[PDB]
Amino acid sequence: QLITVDEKLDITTITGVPEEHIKTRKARIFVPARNNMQSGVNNTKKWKMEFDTRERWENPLMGWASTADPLSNLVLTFSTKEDAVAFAEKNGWSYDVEERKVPKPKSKSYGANFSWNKRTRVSTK
Amino acid sequence: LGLREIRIHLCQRSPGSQGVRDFIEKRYVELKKANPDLPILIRECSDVQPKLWARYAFGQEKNVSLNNFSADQVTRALENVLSSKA
Amino acid sequence: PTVKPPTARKFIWTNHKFNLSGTPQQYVPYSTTRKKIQEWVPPSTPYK
Amino acid sequence: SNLIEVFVDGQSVMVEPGTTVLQACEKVGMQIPRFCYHERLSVAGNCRMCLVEIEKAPKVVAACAMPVMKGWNILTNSEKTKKAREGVMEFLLANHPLDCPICDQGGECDLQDQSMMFGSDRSRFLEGKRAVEDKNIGPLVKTIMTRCIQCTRCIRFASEIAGVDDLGTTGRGNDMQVGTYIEKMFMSELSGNIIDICPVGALTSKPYAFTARPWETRKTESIDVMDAVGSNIVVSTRTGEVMRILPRMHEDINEEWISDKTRFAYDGLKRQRLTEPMVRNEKGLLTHTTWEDALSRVAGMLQSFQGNDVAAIAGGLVDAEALIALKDLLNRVDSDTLCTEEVFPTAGAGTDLRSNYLLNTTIAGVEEADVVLLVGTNPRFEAPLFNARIRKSWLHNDLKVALIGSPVDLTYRYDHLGDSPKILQDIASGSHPFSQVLQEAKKPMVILGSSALQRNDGAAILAAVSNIAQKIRTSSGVTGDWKVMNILHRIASQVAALDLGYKPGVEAIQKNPPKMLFLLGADGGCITRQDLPKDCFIVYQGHHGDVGAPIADVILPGAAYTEKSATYVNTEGRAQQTKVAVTPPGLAREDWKIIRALSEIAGMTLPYDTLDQVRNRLEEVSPNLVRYDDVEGANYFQQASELSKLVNQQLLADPLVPPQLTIKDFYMTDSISRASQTMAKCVKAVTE
Amino acid sequence: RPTVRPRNDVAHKQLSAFGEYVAEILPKYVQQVQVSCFNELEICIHPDGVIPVLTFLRDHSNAQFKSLADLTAVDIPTRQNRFEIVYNLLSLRFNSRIRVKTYTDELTPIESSVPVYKAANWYEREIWDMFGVFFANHPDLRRILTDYGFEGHPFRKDFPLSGYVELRYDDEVKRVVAEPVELAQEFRKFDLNSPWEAFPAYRQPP
Amino acid sequence: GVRTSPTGEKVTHTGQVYDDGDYRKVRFVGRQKEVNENFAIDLIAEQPVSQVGSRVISCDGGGGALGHPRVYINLDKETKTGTCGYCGLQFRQQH
Amino acid sequence: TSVKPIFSRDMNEAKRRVRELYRAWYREVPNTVHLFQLDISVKQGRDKVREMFKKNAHITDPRVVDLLVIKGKMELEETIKVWKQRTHVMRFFHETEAPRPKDFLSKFYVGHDP
Numbered sequence A: 001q002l003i004t005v006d007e008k009l010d011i012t013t014i015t016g017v018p019e020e021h022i023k024t025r026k027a028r029i030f031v032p033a034r035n036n037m038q039s040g041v042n043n044t045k046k047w048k049m050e051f052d053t054r055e056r057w058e059n060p061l062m063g064w065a066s067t068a069d070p071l072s073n074l075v076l077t078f079s080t081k082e083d084a085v086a087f088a089e090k091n092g093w094s095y096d097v098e099e100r101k102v103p104k105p106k107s108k109s110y111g112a113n114f115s116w117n118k119r120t121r122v123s124t125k
Numbered sequence B: 001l002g003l004r005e006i007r008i009h010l011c012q013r014s015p016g017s018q019g020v021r022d023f024i025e026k027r028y029v030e031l032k033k034a035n036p037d038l039p040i041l042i043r044e045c046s047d048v049q050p051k052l053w054a055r056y057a058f059g060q061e062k063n064v065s066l067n068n069f070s071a072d073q074v075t076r077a078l079e080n081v082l083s084s085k086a
Numbered sequence C: 001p002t003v004k005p006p007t008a009r010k011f012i013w014t015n016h017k018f019n020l021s022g023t024p025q026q027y028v029p030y031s032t033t034r035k036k037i038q039e040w041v042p043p044s045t046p047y048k
Numbered sequence D: 001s002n003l004i005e006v007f008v009d010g011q012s013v014m015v016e017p018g019t020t021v022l023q024a025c026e027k028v029g030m031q032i033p034r035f036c037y038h039e040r041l042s043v044a045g046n047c048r049m050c051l052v053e054i055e056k057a058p059k060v061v062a063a064c065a066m067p068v069m070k071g072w073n074i075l076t077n078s079e080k081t082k083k084a085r086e087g088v089m090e091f092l093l094a095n096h097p098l099d100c101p102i103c104d105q106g107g108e109c110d111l112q113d114q115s116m117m118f119g120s121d122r123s124r125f126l127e128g129k130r131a132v133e134d135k136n137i138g139p140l141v142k143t144i145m146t147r148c149i150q151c152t153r154c155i156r157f158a159s160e161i162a163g164v165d166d167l168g169t170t171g172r173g174n175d176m177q178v179g180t181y182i183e184k185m186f187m188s189e190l191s192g193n194i195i196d197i198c199p200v201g202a203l204t205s206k207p208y209a210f211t212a213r214p215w216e217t218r219k220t221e222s223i224d225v226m227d228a229v230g231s232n233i234v235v236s237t238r239t240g241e242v243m244r245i246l247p248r249m250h251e252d253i254n255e256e257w258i259s260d261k262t263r264f265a266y267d268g269l270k271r272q273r274l275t276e277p278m279v280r281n282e283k284g285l286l287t288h289t290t291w292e293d294a295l296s297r298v299a300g301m302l303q304s305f306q307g308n309d310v311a312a313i314a315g316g317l318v319d320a321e322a323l324i325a326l327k328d329l330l331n332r333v334d335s336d337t338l339c340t341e342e343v344f345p346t347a348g349a350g351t352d353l354r355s356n357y358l359l360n361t362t363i364a365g366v367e368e369a370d371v372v373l374l375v376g377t378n379p380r381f382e383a384p385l386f387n388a389r390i391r392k393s394w395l396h397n398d399l400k401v402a403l404i405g406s407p408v409d410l411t412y413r414y415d416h417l418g419d420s421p422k423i424l425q426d427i428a429s430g431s432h433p434f435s436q437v438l439q440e441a442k443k444p445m446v447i448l449g450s451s452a453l454q455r456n457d458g459a460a461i462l463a464a465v466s467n468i469a470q471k472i473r474t475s476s477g478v479t480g481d482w483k484v485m486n487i488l489h490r491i492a493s494q495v496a497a498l499d500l501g502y503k504p505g506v507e508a509i510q511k512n513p514p515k516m517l518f519l520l521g522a523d524g525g526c527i528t529r530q531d532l533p534k535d536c537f538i539v540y541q542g543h544h545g546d547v548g549a550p551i552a553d554v555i556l557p558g559a560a561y562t563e564k565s566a567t568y569v570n571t572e573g574r575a576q577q578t579k580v581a582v583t584p585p586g587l588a589r590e591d592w593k594i595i596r597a598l599s600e601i602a603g604m605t606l607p608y609d610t611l612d613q614v615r616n617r618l619e620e621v622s623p624n625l626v627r628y629d630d631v632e633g634a635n636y637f638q639q640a641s642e643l644s645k646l647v648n649q650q651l652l653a654d655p656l657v658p659p660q661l662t663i664k665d666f667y668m669t670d671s672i673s674r675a676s677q678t679m680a681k682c683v684k685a686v687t688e
Numbered sequence E: 001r002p003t004v005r006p007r008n009d010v011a012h013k014q015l016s017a018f019g020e021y022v023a024e025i026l027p028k029y030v031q032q033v034q035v036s037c038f039n040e041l042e043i044c045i046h047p048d049g050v051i052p053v054l055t056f057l058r059d060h061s062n063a064q065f066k067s068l069a070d071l072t073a074v075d076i077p078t079r080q081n082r083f084e085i086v087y088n089l090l091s092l093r094f095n096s097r098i099r100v101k102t103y104t105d106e107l108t109p110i111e112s113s114v115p116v117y118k119a120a121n122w123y124e125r126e127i128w129d130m131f132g133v134f135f136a137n138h139p140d141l142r143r144i145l146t147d148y149g150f151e152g153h154p155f156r157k158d159f160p161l162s163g164y165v166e167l168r169y170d171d172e173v174k175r176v177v178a179e180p181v182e183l184a185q186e187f188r189k190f191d192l193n194s195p196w197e198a199f200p201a202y203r204q205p206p
Numbered sequence F: 001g002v003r004t005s006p007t008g009e010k011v012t013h014t015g016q017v018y019d020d021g022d023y024r025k026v027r028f029v030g031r032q033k034e035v036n037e038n039f040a041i042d043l044i045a046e047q048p049v050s051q052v053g054s055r056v057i058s059c060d061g062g063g064g065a066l067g068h069p070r071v072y073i074n075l076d077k078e079t080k081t082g083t084c085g086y087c088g089l090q091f092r093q094q095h
Numbered sequence G: 001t002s003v004k005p006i007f008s009r010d011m012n013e014a015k016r017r018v019r020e021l022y023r024a025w026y027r028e029v030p031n032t033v034h035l036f037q038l039d040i041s042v043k044q045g046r047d048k049v050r051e052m053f054k055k056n057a058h059i060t061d062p063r064v065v066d067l068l069v070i071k072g073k074m075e076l077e078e079t080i081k082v083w084k085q086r087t088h089v090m091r092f093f094h095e096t097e098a099p100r101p102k103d104f105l106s107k108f109y110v111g112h113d114p
């Protein structure tokens, strides 16, 4: 037998996260930009959630990068921004949502390289 | 102790800012000539409810809502501020 | 090694060392990279 | 109606005529492998990696170049297609050098990745390999040309995007070599983009060489502040250190390019940094101190002054959060002398109307214009990506460009009307023949450079230019809601400061010299101690010790744009925000927090304690400042043009000369680039 | 073909036939049935059907899955019901395996399957411990693997790898104490995924 | 190529050395700073340039499969030598 | 918006369980202090119990309340059966943790975190 619940889903109290790492964090919800060094687009399909970057300092002994941020490496993956937003809301994180950038359709014509009277004519091949 | 700056916020297309848009189109130039060295910062932004901000000496501020105001009410709200000294 | 001597190299230690832990010859770790950020040094003369 | 039906592995897709096979595949989420093809360059068709079988056709077609025909079924995964890819990959790797461990491309290499995904897993090449000699094309791009695969992307980018026809191919066949033939340096403000578009490690970043591998870098999406274009970037960091800057695609701003200053000046962030608060000692020398002590000294002076006795100057890299915090603090002592370094005429409407000081047409709108008039600007060096958008329209739309000012090389041919400001009056009056071009244009665009407004007759020039833009709009020669008047800014902080109500230029300070002066990253030297009373108390807040710092009484180390989440408004009026890539060094602090902390110690606590609260404050002052990535249109050009006429200024006889006439002037313009050893190498390279 | 795993069509057909058999007999609960290309049969069910479906497979004469090989959970944060509950069962009579899957979220109890398999006792305690899925009517549900008083469910995808707290002996209080985690060397995140698609057969529609 | 600083600390081949006011050099008090004294930059410079009769030469570092991946070095320029990117050996086209 | 309950069908039923759990914890503190030979007082232990309950006073979802009670009962069981050691009980008090400053200025002086 089911019951009726109208409260906004909030699980912050039963996840065990320290209060500091709920209230003071800013989740970033976005589709990663294509790495400009490569033409492949397979890393731009899904939505990601990452958190604000915090201090890294040099370990006195070795010079290694030390951190006190337990979420420094946390990156979550989502099928849609709605799924990402829903996950952020129920976990109590404030977030920013960046709309997906999709390359616009380009008009390509190999023949334009040899135009009779247009600047598109290429001087070399 | 008096006025330091006026700011007018409005939307470019929403009907609620229609009276403010008329005021700017028809009255801002005359108002600017009268108050030449008073900053009247008009800042349009889509889908904001119109508002009139007044900043007085030492950083005190007041805001009056202009939603669904006529161009005349906008004039009146402007005069209520150009003579107030909060 | 008396029948199959090792290959000689200029850089190979000619003098083997045993475990030096606990002695003044012990290894002490440290960062081998130089300072990453240079601070601005204010002028040595007055002008305020 | 117009669309035709094709099939991608049996899946129907409707595409416009002229769509290539490769573009049709990308409509159903299939990325055809490629090397020579780049969607922003002209089609080449030489690598042959894109060969794909068309059902019932015996010959594979180059998908990047072949227009799709109605009813074609493109088999992107057939055995014929796979064997074609394997064969081409085999030829590509036959002479390629076994360089991956020493090659900086390794780990983000399209040759490696497409070899893994589409090539065979072994070699049957039993011969010796080709070896090619390396070319020296300057201090930014390292060439290891044995790795080149002759894709000609670099050649096409240099010719079409950068408008520089220096790269080509010499020789023939297997010995064909990409280069300059002669010893020659590829110094263009967009040169570094060939590193990105080169699919292999043939062209690599010299400053970046050997320092990192792609998999270990952290990517922070951020914004550029080297100019006012607002190019989107990615800051690569590793273990708390900035390693390089990369373009981040944004179709309406920089596309996928960045200027060389944006790309290579980041090394200035590791030099001459302000890491500790400093105060003058009894001997008159700057000495390190605590935050408590430095702010107590500043708060003490602030409490003892009021009104005109306190002033502030904002520099070119200051963010909006700091700009409004400082404005609020000075307002609480009843000061309104909040100034910027970049002048803008306050005559008429001044900064009351946003349309007065914005690039109203937007950057993307240049692709719609049919005539562009440039006045008193060198956009190539003031806004390299804006100038690249003009060239793109010049190349593809046959745009007509006219210029008033010095005949600088713009990488495209334009009509030079002269450098005399009188030409504006002649054009406005119909005497000049080019006024007929503006009348017959359906979408004219008049762009006045902010550098021209730094003259003493700036108001007159702005009035004259606005008069021209008004003659066209009033004449109904244009279309619907097409904005004609434009201001091209070159300073990252300028538009946000104008939105917030700052006073453009330091004229107010020269009128009423203050007793206390805040230099918020102000490093242009517009106001020196010669212009201030003898006992003036100067506070410098910034991230670099450059011009302002050595004359201050108190130094407050702030954060650079890589070290804070801060708001910048580009020349269009688009608000964008950076993200923290690394934290500020030493004891440096976020710039708005310094002012918020100072306000508390001085008894005038500001009403915001967090980044989101200070951003709510920005919305109170200017709602558009929190609409990130949005371009809020500005209207009322007609009211502004009315106020422009009622007061008359005279043009000076000086010709319009931009501050940057040659590439040597491009590299060092702010405190970060002045501190960059890479930019110094660029400056030396082009002057020697 | 020496390097390619050989297919087994006969086992694929048998498992497919049995998968329909189960779906026909328990339509009330079965939502999806699939057989993988390496011949493993999965029954996806509504969570209400855990006990009836598991009981049927254990007891029915043509099933006889008498052994619960394993019981575990998978966290998929993008799903409304983030937790997938996986039962792996073995039939000695018919020398076969079957996988039964259901779902739940952070607040919806699942019926404990201890009545069907006594093996489920500790597996469900581990699922509660590591994922925070509550099982109703469990004889003794409590943490099993984590420290006493440990806060959180480590195997959730949003729980950080190194946790939130770390331990050391403090001489002043003469005991082991827990303090917020600080690492001398931060774990170095690597971005390994190639920007190029590897497996066309699994491409998702745009 | 070990050189010492004014404080006396040996300078490593990566140029590392603690500066005068650096507290971190307290770690060496009563112990020692481990420094390798066979500087590879000085050792490779002692190797003679190899004269060859072709425009292109291949290097695998010596030892066949015990060396490094085999690379081909172009020797067309006469201003400088061809240097192996892996092992630092130098080559020159004779005459 | 129709969901399967855990134990409670509404907040009133849920709050009964909360009160019952609080009574059990309240009565257990004196035994815990003696059994674990704690140096805190019975009042401190009960003040800590109240503080732990009070921080969840804003919950209005009966399913969340049920889980909090479920987890609270598990924690109580670990204490009564002495599965916890002294270190585990004393972790509630953060004795070795230095006072984290709260006001804007204090945080500004020490670092960058908000």
Ligand code: SF4
Binding pocket: D096, D097, D098, D099, D100, D101, D103, D104, D105, D106, D107, D109, D110, D111, D112, D147, D199, D200, D201, D202
């Ligand atoms: S360009 Fe790519 S394939 Fe060629 S050596 Fe460099 S990493 Fe290897």
Ligand code: SF4
Binding pocket: D147, D148, D149, D150, D151, D152, D153, D154, D155, D178, D197, D198, D199, D200, D202, D203
């Ligand atoms: S240098 Fe790079 S971009 Fe230019 S042709 Fe060679 S592989 Fe292509």
Ligand code: FES
Binding pocket: D033, D034, D035, D036, D037, D044, D045, D046, D047, D048, D049, D050, D051, D062, D063, D064, D065
């Ligand atoms: S991508 Fe089509 S031939 Fe190169």
Ligand SMILES: [K+]
Binding pocket: D105, D194, D195, D196, D197, D198, D199, D200, D201, D202, D203, D204
């Ligand atoms: K490259």
Ligand SMILES: [Zn+2]
Binding pocket: F059, F060, F061, F062, F068, F084, F085, F086, F087, F088, F089
């Ligand atoms: Zn070698």
